[PDB]
């Protein structure tokens, strides 16, 4: 496994940003996931080499942080808050609307690999409950008609 030049230069930028190389580990993993749609297990050894860290340190970090996914490749991660406020205000209505539009449940990926529903804890936008994200974009769920129009923007 070798990182493509375009990705390798971005990883090098994160590594040169902090006073110590190892501090860039989360920024680098965020970059790897953005590029591939997941964390390829084969990418961990060349990243560990770039950060000057043992492979098991990098493996332990990927396993600890919930945003990182080593199993499913997805173009768009639909992060659905399942915490207390969103639950009270309508998470189940948002999850039913996602099932009606995409045919998938939390933890599943669409057959085309376009969307994955990721249940998450409080997203810190509780006054706008029920909350969801589509990769970096965040929204309040209003209705299935409103949600359908939002999802059509992700090609």
């Amino acid at each position: 496994f070798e990182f493509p030049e375009e990705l390798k230069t971005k990883l090098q930028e994160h590594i040169n940003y902090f006073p110590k190389k190892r501090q860039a580990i989360l920024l680098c993993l965020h970059e790897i996931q953005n590029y591939y749609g997941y964390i390829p297990p084969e990418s961990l050894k060349p990243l560990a080499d770039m950060l000057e860290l043992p492979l098991n340190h990098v493996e332990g970090v990927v396993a600890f942080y919930d945003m990182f996914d080593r199993e499913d490749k997805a173009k768009y991660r639909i992060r659905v808050c399942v915490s207390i406020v969103c639950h009270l205000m309508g998470t189940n209505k948002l999850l039913k609307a996602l099932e009606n539009i995409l045919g998938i449940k939390p933890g599943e990926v669409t057959p085309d690999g376009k969307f994955k529903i990721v249940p998450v804890q409080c997203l810190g936008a509780c006054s706008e409950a029920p909350v969801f994200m589509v990769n970096d974009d965040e929204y309040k769920f209003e209705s299935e008609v409103q949600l359908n129009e939002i999802l059509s923007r992700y090609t």
Partner: protein, 419 residues
């Protein structure tokens, strides 16, 4: 400059301080900030000695807005008793359920936070500062990175700031989905490029922090008060609210209210006033059943006349107000809290690791009416036994809110025992 989409959280103020600009749901860039006299508190601070700044922050009565209410000036005094180099850290992890107060400052008035970080770093003699922002705040991360560059271009950051001889760089680190990285020692571990595992305290970070060096960790909201203390002076700041717990406070209000959002209010405001006078009362005018102070405490409808301050009988915490009404099932709400602790324990301590898991597993059996008599006794035992040997605040409070619902709503819990 394009940022990811963010929902427009409603913000209202009676003080026009932390929300002077942030009451408008948009990024206020450096030119607009300068037009309001922004960075003038930093210029005044660079003409004061670091010791005078610590003194005004101490005399202002500013307390930690991250939830524990520790006196800010006293924390800074502890850091400067130890030899340098020292570090300053802005805690922007904000992952407590119901809490969305800090993102309002970050996304709308980033220069207020930046000015506060510069003055605070100068006060403690730190030449490197870090903002640790949760991974689920990507717009906040990009906004901060751009605002720091704007500050650098105008000469407010870098070497020899405004000819003062003071050097500072602000680095922005991103989290990656762990609520425990909000705990200041786990945050430091994460900044050092490791798993977010809390450290045994004492030593507190002011003695041994980032790379084992004296480190001050403060919450976003605490820091955003620092430009006001310098600008107004500590006496003027101390006239806001009660003179013992002075200053503006941000209150993220959500759940069953007519006007959910962030309210900037003095700390003499009562919980009843937050809900009914400011947040417009309840949805459908239903009776208040409970208020969840994040995942920390449960207040009943008999406890609404309490002040929103850091006094022994005050609301305290982060000022997080989650409103539940008469229709909301307390056991189902307790299950959501149990699920949160189950998902967030770092697993270092055995009673916390196994207890957070078992509390949620057994409460789910109870909620579905599948619990045996042993499961009920086991749930009661586990709830009381998550804290032993715990080395951080998560294990100490994972059973707190749930135990409070058992004590305050016995009739509702009893209905599930018979189910």
């Amino acid at each position: 400059r394009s940022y990811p989409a963010i929902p427009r959280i409603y913000a209202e103020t009676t003080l026009n301080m932390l929300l002077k600009r942030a009451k408008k749901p948009r990024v206020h860039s450096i030119d607009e900030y300068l037009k309001d006299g922004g960075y003038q508190a930093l210029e005044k601070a660079l003409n004061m000695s670091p010791e005078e700044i610590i003194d005004w922050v101490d005399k202002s009565t500013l307390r930690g807005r991250g939830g524990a209410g520790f006196p800010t000036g006293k924390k800074w005094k502890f850091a400067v008793q130890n030899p340098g180099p020292r570090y300053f850290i802005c805690n922007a992890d904000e992952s407590e359920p119901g809490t969305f107060k800090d993102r309002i400052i970050i996304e709308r008035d980033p220069h207020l936070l930046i000015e506060g970080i510069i003055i605070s770093s100068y006060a403690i003699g730190a030449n490197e500062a870090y903002i640790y922002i949760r991974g689920e705040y990507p717009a906040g991360y990009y906004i901060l990175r751009d605002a720091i560059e704007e500050a650098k271009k105008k000469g407010f950051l870098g070497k020899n700031i405004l000819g003062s001889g003071f050097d500072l760089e602000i680095y922005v680190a991103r989290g990656a989905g762990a609520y425990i990285c909000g705990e200041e020692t786990a945050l430091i571990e994460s900044l050092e490029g490791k798993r977010g595992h809390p450290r045994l305290k004492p030593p507190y970070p002011v003695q041994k922090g980032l790379w084992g060096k004296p480190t001050v960790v403060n919450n976003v909201e605490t820091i955003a008060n620092v430009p006001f203390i310098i600008s107004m002076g500590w006496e003027e700041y101390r006239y806001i609210g009660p003179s013992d717990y002075a200053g503006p406070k941000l209150f993220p209000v959500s759940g069953k209210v007519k006007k959910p959002g962030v309210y900037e209010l003095p700390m003499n405001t009562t919980l009843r006033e937050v809900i009914f006078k400011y947040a417009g009362g309840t949805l459908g005018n239903k009776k208040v059943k409970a208020v969840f102070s994040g995942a920390l405490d449960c207040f009943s409808s008999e406890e609404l006349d309490i002040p929103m301050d850091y006094s022994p009988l005050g609301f305290g915490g982060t000022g997080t107000v989650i409103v539940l009404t008469e229709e909301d099932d307390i056991v189902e709400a307790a299950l959501k809290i149990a699920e949160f602790y189950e998902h967030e324990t770092c697993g270092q301590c055995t009673p916390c690791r196994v207890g957070c898991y078992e509390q949620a597993n057994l409460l789910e059996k109870i909620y579905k009416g599948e619990a045996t008599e042993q499961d009920w006794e086991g749930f009661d035992f586990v709830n009381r036994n998550i804290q032993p040997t715990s080395i951080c605040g998560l294990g100490a409070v994972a059973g707190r809110l749930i135990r409070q619902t058992l004590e305050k709503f016995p009739e509702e819990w009893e209905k599930y025992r018979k189910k």
